[PDB]
Design a binder for this molecule. Structure first.
Ligand SMILES: [Fe+3]
Ligand SMILES: [Fe+3]
Ligand SMILES: [Fe+3]
Ligand SMILES: [Fe+3]
Lengths: 124, 124, 124, 124
């Protein structure tokens, strides 16, 4: 059968119905290309436009980081959950990185599954 | 035998050793005084300056709202959990309100407990 | 003005509509009266009978512990979030304690707010 | 680069150093082979034996369900977070399923990443 990782939707592997839903469920990551080690910087993650109702909303977003050279990966960075109708899926985190790697954002829609975006960040 | 509600630290209630910790644990809420119904606005919540390590950090922040004329209260708005060492306890949410009320922020430090801050918001 | 801890419903201090909603929202805790320090035991926490739909369900349960002699309190033990329609608000945790104290259970219903129950635990 | 789904450890795909960590990080799912639609039943999920310290513990477990015939998948069932040193990674949920599918448990160790187990459940 399918492993969990095969189930996560990405825009470049979108198939069938999923294709039409990619633009409004794939997280958008706004982050600098380059940061200094140990220095705080902001990352904004937003999803949509998308409905926001009890029956249908982006429920949460999780952020992970693949850190270069780590014996195991990834490192979870944060998780934010949004109450339907009150909080929009658009959030700004403050992060400190130590080493270059890859930032992953995963959002969940209760109807339309798990969607992944990723962005490389260089740490100098 | 205290109720759970009595355990929550308010800087306006700080007795004992709680006094000294209050500045570095009490959430700061930045939000407008007045917003328009159903119009998205941003709320920044930050705690610090505070240690950020596995043994000691702000683990999470929860946002609640007391909505005026709501038969039961409060309403949870959202929740963010931070990874020790990687995410700083400084987050911006995007919210939508329909009725005036009081915005509550609760931060948790694994060593130092629950800290409440509040702000009134008016909805036009 | 109202502080956050004042908003939490106790069957203790339930009045008004909060009286009639109390039986179906207040957490029921099954735990031993006495446990050996650092020895794992089980705590079952359940809420109901209660609706379980997108529009209306028990969204989560948080477990806190007031540890006797800790300079700050409480300590969160765990948190469980339930998906509407699929997971019932009935959960068993495995805990281990080092000192006697008071166990707190907090459930959240999206329409009916926060509900507290508590149980003293002795540790030998 | 690497997609997030490719990062999740499974015992059959364990490469190198991760092979030796598999027994103590892969979730163990105890669940019935067969249930009736809409009828509650228990699923126990545990991980280990594993250390449980601030510096190193199973931080959380998430449960998802691949539901047969659903246009998108999977459905998140629930999530449980454990406070290090206090809650062991051994939890029992109560679930109601509506249609046959595959149950997934994902646990996270702060040092050793994300691990997956899966179990097929028939719903009649
Ligand atoms: Fe959707
Ligand atoms: Fe602290
Ligand atoms: Fe209710
Ligand atoms: Fe480990």
């Amino acid at each position: 059968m399918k492993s969990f990782g095969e189930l996560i939707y990405t825009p470049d592997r979108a198939e069938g119905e999923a294709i039409s839903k990619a633009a409004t469920h794939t997280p958008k990551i706004e982050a600098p290309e380059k940061v200094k080690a140990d220095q705080p910087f902001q990352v904004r993650v937003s999803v949509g436009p998308h409905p926001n109702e009890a029956a249908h909303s982006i429920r949460w977003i999780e952020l992970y980081f693949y850190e270069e050279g780590r014996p195991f990966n990834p490192v979870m960075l944060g998780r934010v959950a949004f109450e339907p109708g009150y909080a929009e899926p658009d959030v700004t985190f403050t992060l400190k990185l130590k080493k270059s790697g890859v930032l992953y954002a995963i959002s969940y829609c209760n109807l339309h599954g798990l969607w992944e975006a990723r962005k490389e960040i260089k740490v100098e």
